[PDB]
Amino acid sequence: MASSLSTVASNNLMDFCSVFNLIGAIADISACRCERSAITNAFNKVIAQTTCIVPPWSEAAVRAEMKGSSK
Amino acid sequence: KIIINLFAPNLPGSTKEDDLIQKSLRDQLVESIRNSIAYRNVFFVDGTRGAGKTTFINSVVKSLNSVNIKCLPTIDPTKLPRHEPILVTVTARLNKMVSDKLKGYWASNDYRKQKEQWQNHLAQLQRGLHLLTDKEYKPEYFSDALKLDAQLDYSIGGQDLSEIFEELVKRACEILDCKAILITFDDIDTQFDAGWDVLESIRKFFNSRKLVVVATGDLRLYSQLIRGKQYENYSKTLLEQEKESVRLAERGYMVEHLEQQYLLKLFPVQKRIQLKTMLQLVGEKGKAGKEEIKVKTEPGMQDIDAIDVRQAIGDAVREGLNLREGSDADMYVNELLKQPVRLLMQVLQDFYTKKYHATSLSVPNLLRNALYGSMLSSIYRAGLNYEQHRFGMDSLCKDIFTYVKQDRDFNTGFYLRPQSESEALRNCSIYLASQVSENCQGSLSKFLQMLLVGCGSVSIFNQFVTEDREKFEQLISEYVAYMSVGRIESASHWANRCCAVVANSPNDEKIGVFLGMVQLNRKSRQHMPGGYKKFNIDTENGLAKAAMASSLSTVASNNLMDFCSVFNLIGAIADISACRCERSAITNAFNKVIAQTTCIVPPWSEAQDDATEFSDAITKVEQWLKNVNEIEIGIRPSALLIGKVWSRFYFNLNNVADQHKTRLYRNAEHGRMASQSNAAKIMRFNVLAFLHAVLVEESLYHSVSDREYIGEGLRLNPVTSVDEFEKKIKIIGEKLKADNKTWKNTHPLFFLLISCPILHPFIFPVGGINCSVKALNKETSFNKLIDEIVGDKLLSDEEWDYLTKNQQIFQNTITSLNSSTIVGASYDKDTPAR
RNA sequence: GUCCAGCGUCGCUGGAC
Ligand SMILES: Nc1ncnc2c1ncn2[C@@H]1O[C@H](COP(=O)(O)OP(=O)(O)OP(=O)(O)O)[C@@H](O)[C@H]1O
Fold this sequence. Notes:
Shape of chain A: elongated
PDB class: immune system
Organism of A, B: Escherichia coli
Bound molecules: adenosine-5'-triphosphate
Chains A, B: Archaeal ATPase
Helix content of chain A: 40-55%
Largest interface: A-B, 7 and 10 residues
Keywords: Cryoelectron microscopy, adenosine triphosphatase, immune system
Entry title: Structure of heptameric RdrA ring in RNA-loading state
Oligomer: part of a larger assembly
């Protein structure tokens, strides 16, 4: 779930679960070519909380930036 | 590890080996030339304008000079006689070397046989030179030719110069004992009409294996030269006859194809070499760089303490524009790194040299002067003011509006972010942001003028005028005249023009509530429930009548219309802070619009003792002005800071007018619950929004503080309650106290705008307090914190209890505005309880 | 669960116990 959870801030903080996130997780992990020590680092970096801002060509770009990305 | 000294002459030819930038590229191309001759052979070093296009060529020649290749002296067609052909110049330079070699040789009698052969070939070239410079054919030369000679065994008969010149080069190579001869040209940016003769003399006379040509220029300029020579081939009578759109396309492609076959044949693609800009060499943000560049900012600096080129501009932009350490400051520097090398270094050389002598200040002034002389061409096409003496307040306000007009983006235009795709708008933006930090630095009065006039003009025009490609700018010319922006006038005068423009468009149900304004009543209403009545002006007192008087505007089109614009308060405050003395402005500002200004709708419309009480109000203002003088010297506004403040302020006002619009009720007198809205409550939140927008991002974007004290959480605006405004006030309070930093030294803008006597009555009116079991907990805590920051206790014990519960003489509180009626309400329904 | 508030044109979101 943590690997497949991503949130977007447009007018109110929206939460999403996208299959494209899973492909991003596999793509990041598979390029490790490292021992056990780096796996814990890489696996911990994959699972996190990421918030991305709305593209400029939308009608809620200014409000989203104004409201700030936080909790 | 390249060290650049700004105090060197910095001429194009002044660069030595240590000063040269692209040292790796120089050796790479020298190897390419050497290899090619060992095994068309025309090299083209391509570089943008003002990027080492001449110094690099000299270094390449110097490396070759010190398999043998004799380098000809570099030539440039621009600094030559107009009508002299290239072939004559090259032949002249060949003559000098071989004659110098022959005379210096002085061994045996070789220079008696070789000299005759060399002299024979020159005479042959001199005979056939008349073909180059003939405007017509001369028939008597026909018998001059056909005097065939077996000498050199020419492949083809005739008086062709190409074959004669070829044998000329072969003899010189034998004499000089060199494998090949290198001919170096130069760019034609100054006068690119002379570049055609170079191209013709390369495609005709330089095609042997003994000659290597190194040309310099810009393909974006050479293509225009060639395409011009193509359209001169079409018969004029044809160009002016078949003017169909279908035919224009047919001839358009036949030329855009003909030039490419010319270039791809004359300068082969595998031989072109592109120069490197600063961004490529240095790197993006934290990315590793291909090379290392460092600069020196002082003659006394040590070579072991030279800072990086990125950091040198980084400080010149941070304090130059008065910007903090953040991404937005890193966006300006990144744009500068993509500038031409000459322009990038000149603005740095001017800035650091002038700054050093000044110390032996006004740092932004040096940056503005450097930028003005640098991108002075882009200003002219933008059309901004170019007169140094007219640099002022309104002239700057004109510049902002025109730049937004050219950019065609009224939402984020005033941010002055260099994000426009066009190069002129990007260049003009950085200069403009410097001027904002110039005028508005150190004075509160000018800051409020930029906020209200510089950015207010753009936003209002967006929503009330632009809601046909010739009507659009017809309004722009009409709009710029009506607001009278450009003329030297006070901000208070601008407020009335702002009031007239907005009020023309009637909203749904024609309620008298607009963006930051309320339309009060002039005539008498019939059968009004409760104590609702007309707004009687002469019932206020000292420090309250003046607050109202400076907040009243009138427009005299059709019937007389009154208003209570909050924009007037901002303008009135600016005027007081301007003069700061003489006790006359504070006498005159309070009475400037009440009975003198007769505003008319825009043409696009389609319709106690007085003496003993006023001086007490006057004296408090003079006390406020005394404090401003000693603290406002530390104001360092930036174009980002002012632009962002208007954004939050504008959005906040639009919501308040749209949420209190339908909340008027027949029993909304002295409104105690948040679901009831009176006239005084609307004006309370209008002045509260302005006091809130400053607080939120005074911490975020100001330059005096290196961090923010807001904390973590969503940024929200007060529209119905003061829960959000109080919440931020508290949180900063402990953060500013746990770490010992006074409010004056971190939020100078908010400290001054919160202690102004004009806004004090508006903060706590009679009918604008939320009286509830839970609400009064916040309001009281709001009152305690405001008084603690100001120091003075605004409200005494008796009046505070009088307001909260449900006539005591009041001087620091509005008392009659809530009872005043509002046009279009009619107060039929009643408040609902649940 | 309940109460307050904020964004969009009822839905969404923050915060408190
Ligand atoms: N290697 C270098 N190191 C430092 N500065 C350089 C270097 N090469 C060029 N410059 C800068 O470029 C400026 C002028 O460059 P250059 O004359 O080659 O360009 P140009 O004016 O476009 O070309 P041209 O003079 O042939 O018309 C110099 O004054 C100098 O500031």
